[PDB]
């Protein structure tokens, strides 16, 4: 049908800034675009309609333009409540399609994660399970790549990650990583490594332990 593309998943800015998210149509919408705002608590509102330009009860800082294939929402002066996810939507041709959405996020100095490893707990091992966990706390920006190593190599299976939204006091992200094995498998190997690669340096932050040394 009519694709809807927002080149940017996440957009950074500071309060007081003039923020512009963009949205591109696979074809000519002849000005039938609308803007939706979804706040973290999941609720969605209507900010603008009809090729942008049109409001609803929304504050003046909210502006909007475009035509044909390109269109964009501008928030002339960013305010805390404006931190949400914005989707665009072409109401020209059936079916009605949306845009991946552009989540804003506060700008913070680069930080670098605090990497921590943890061996399986006795209480778990006696169950016959064995999970090695790894926390990469309070880092920014939000892109980070973690890599597991069992006895100097491999390991992709059993690795389940979780990521937290941006913090509200400071604006850092955090990440949980768990590698699940079987007490037997776990016991067949010695060193386990959790390698955190972040743009904050070239050298991966490496934290690990050896069962033999426990």
């Amino acid at each position: 049908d009519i694709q809807m593309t927002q080149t940017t998943s996440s957009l950074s800015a500071s309060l007081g800034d003039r923020v512009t998210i963009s949205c591109r149509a696979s074809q000519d919408i002849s000005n039938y675009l609308n803007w939706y705002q979804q706040k973290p608590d999941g609720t969605v509102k209507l900010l603008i309609y009809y090729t942008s330009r049109l409001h609803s009860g929304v504050p003046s800082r909210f502006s909007g333009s475009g035509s044909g294939t390109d269109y964009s929402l501008t928030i002339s002066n960013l305010e805390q409540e404006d931190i949400a996810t914005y989707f665009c939507q072409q109401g020209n041709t059936l079916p009605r399609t949306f845009g991946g959405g552009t989540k804003l996020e506060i700008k913070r100095a680069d930080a670098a994660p605090t990497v921590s490893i943890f061996p399986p707990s006795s209480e778990q091992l006696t169950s016959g399970g064995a999970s090695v966990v790894c926390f990469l706390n309070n880092f920014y920006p939000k892109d980070i790549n973690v890599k597991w190593k069992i006895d100097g190599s491999e390991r992709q299976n059993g690795v389940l990650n979780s990521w937290t939204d941006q913090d509200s006091k400071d604006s850092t992200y955090s990440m949980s990583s768990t590698l699940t094995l079987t007490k037997d498998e776990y016991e067949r190997h010695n060193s386990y490594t959790c390698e955190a690669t972040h743009k904050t340096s070239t050298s991966p932050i490496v934290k690990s332990f050896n069962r033999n040394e426990c």
Partner: protein, 218 residues
């Protein structure tokens, strides 16, 4: 004030079917169309389809038709959506919204709180709280592993809440058809193991509450 309250969240075995509610108030229910958008954590809002309450006329988006059926109740001014032959693919949050005209084409000006749908065959089952302690320098990080529980949610606090800052409770993730989550608290080294640092995980569905203490060693 135009309002639209949707149904509570739902838990349903796949293959099955469900009918969720969207009740309007504060306006002529018959005068505007109802839409249904679906949202899966993998971002993006899909367009299920539209229904005009007055004529009962409907319009689906080919990818949703057949499994989906949009019906109203002009009497109690309340729109419905019935999803059939469910799968794990349509576990998401479903929104209903009001459609207005304005020159040339419609837009959605009012949404609902949405209803969360979860398609699982699991049944209420307590978690297994596992203490995360360092191995055998100013600040030290501990943790607690909550694994094997169903359904959501779980409440984790440290020392019954006395440790607010420096905590991190990651979203859950789907293990072998069961949930798992982790939480980390950071405290000066003077606090532990000098003092007690404990995690309190609460899993309502099973009416559970477990305090797991973080002791040194393994």
């Amino acid at each position: 004030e135009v309002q639209l309250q949707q149904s509570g969240a739902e838990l349903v075995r796949a293959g099955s079917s469900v009918k969720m509610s969207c009740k309007a108030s504060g306006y002529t229910f018959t005068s505007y169309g109802i839409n249904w958008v679906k949202q899966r954590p993998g971002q993006g809002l899909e367009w299920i389809g539209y229904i005009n309450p007055g004529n009962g006329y409907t319009k689906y988006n080919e990818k949703f038709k057949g499994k989906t059926t949009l019906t109203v109740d002009k009497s109690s001014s309340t729109a419905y959506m019935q999803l059939r032959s469910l799968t794990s693919e349509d576990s998401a949050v479903y929104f209903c919204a009001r459609s207005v005209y304005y020159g040339g084409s419609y837009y959605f000006d009012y949404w609902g709180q949405g209803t969360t749908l979860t398609v699982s065959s699991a049944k209420t089952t307590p978690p297994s709280v596992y203490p995360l302690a360092p191995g055998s320098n100013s600040m030290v990080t501990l943790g607690c592993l909550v694994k094997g529980y169903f359904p959501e949610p779980v409440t984790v606090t440290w020392n019954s809440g006395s440790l607010s800052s420096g905590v991190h409770t990651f979203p859950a993730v789907l293990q072998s058809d069961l949930y798992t989550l982790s939480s980390s608290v950071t405290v000066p080294s003077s606090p532990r193991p000098s003092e007690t640092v404990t995690c309190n995980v609460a899993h309502p569905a099973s009416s559970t509450k477990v305090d797991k203490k973080i002791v040194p060693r393994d």
